[PDB]
């Protein structure tokens, strides 16, 4: 429960954007939208993210990728085993409440950036 002060907000936002143990392929719009997580494109006024991946696992398991269950990839880490994910890809909309997505489930190695052992960034594919 205790977190480094400079990590707290980045970690909170990592959980919000990317930790979705209960997420499903057909709930991208509801989960991303203002009735739930209100996930927004960084640096924008309520802008729809082009892509947002939810890892279908709990935060405890995902955090282990920052340590024993990951391997180094530059200054990031790559999971040693793959995870189930739902990738939400933008279909329509500029800003909330109009962000509409298609969700696709896959199993994939996840690449994260960690700080002090805490996940702070999920590395999305360049093209989605
Ligand atoms: Cl790996």
Author numbering: -2 to -1, 1 to 126
Question: Which text from the study accompanies this structure?
Answer:
Pyrimidine-specific ribonucleases with homology to bovine pancreatic ribonuclease A (RNase A; EC 3.1.27.5) are remarkably widespread among vertebrates. Current structural data indicate that catalytically active members of the superfamily typically comprise a polypeptide chain of 119 ± 15 residues, have an α + β topology with three conserved disulphide bond positions (SCOP12 code 54076), and employ a catalytic triad of residues (two His, one Lys) to cleave RNA on the 3′-side of pyrimidine nucleotides. Recent surveys of the data from zebrafish cDNA and genome sequencing projects have led to the identification and characterisation of RNase A homologues in this species. Our structures of RNases ZF-1a and-3e are the first ichthyic ribonuclease structures to be reported.
RNase ZF-1a cleaves tRNA with a specific activity that is almost identical with that of human angiogenin (hAng), i.e. some four to five orders of magnitude lower than that of RNase A. This is the first report of its activity toward a polymeric substrate. In RNase ZF-1a, the anticipated binding position of the pyrimidine is taken by the side chain of Glu122, which makes two hydrogen bonds with Thr51. This is reminiscent of hAng, in which a similar obstruction is posed by the corresponding residue, Gln117.21,29 One residue upstream of the obstructive residue, the main chain begins a deviation from the neighbouring β-strand that marks the beginning of a novel C-terminal conformation. Overall, the C-terminal conformation is less obstructive than that found in hAng; notably, Val125 points away from the B1 subsite, while its hAng counterpart, Phe120, encroaches on the pyrimidine-binding zone. The segment is stabilised chiefly by a network of electrostatic and polar interactions involving the side chains of two residues from the C-terminal segment (Asp123 and Asn126) and two residues from the main body of the protein (Lys85 and Arg106). In the region of the C-terminal segment, RNase ZF-1a bears an obvious (though incomplete) resemblance to hAng. The binding of RNA substrates to hAng requires a major structural rearrangement of this region, and the same appears to be true for RNase ZF-1a, which most likely underpins its low level of ribonucleolytic activity. In RNase ZF-1a, Lys85 lies adjacent to Thr51 and is the counterpart of the modulatory residues Thr80 and Asp83 that are found in hAng and RNase A, respectively. No other known RNase structure features a Lys residue at this position. At the B1 subsite of RNase ZF-1a, the position of Lys85 and the correspondence of Arg106 to Arg101 of RNase 4 suggest that this enzyme will bind uridine more avidly than cytosine, whereas in RNase ZF-3e, the positions of Thr86 and Arg107 suggest an ambivalence as for hAng.
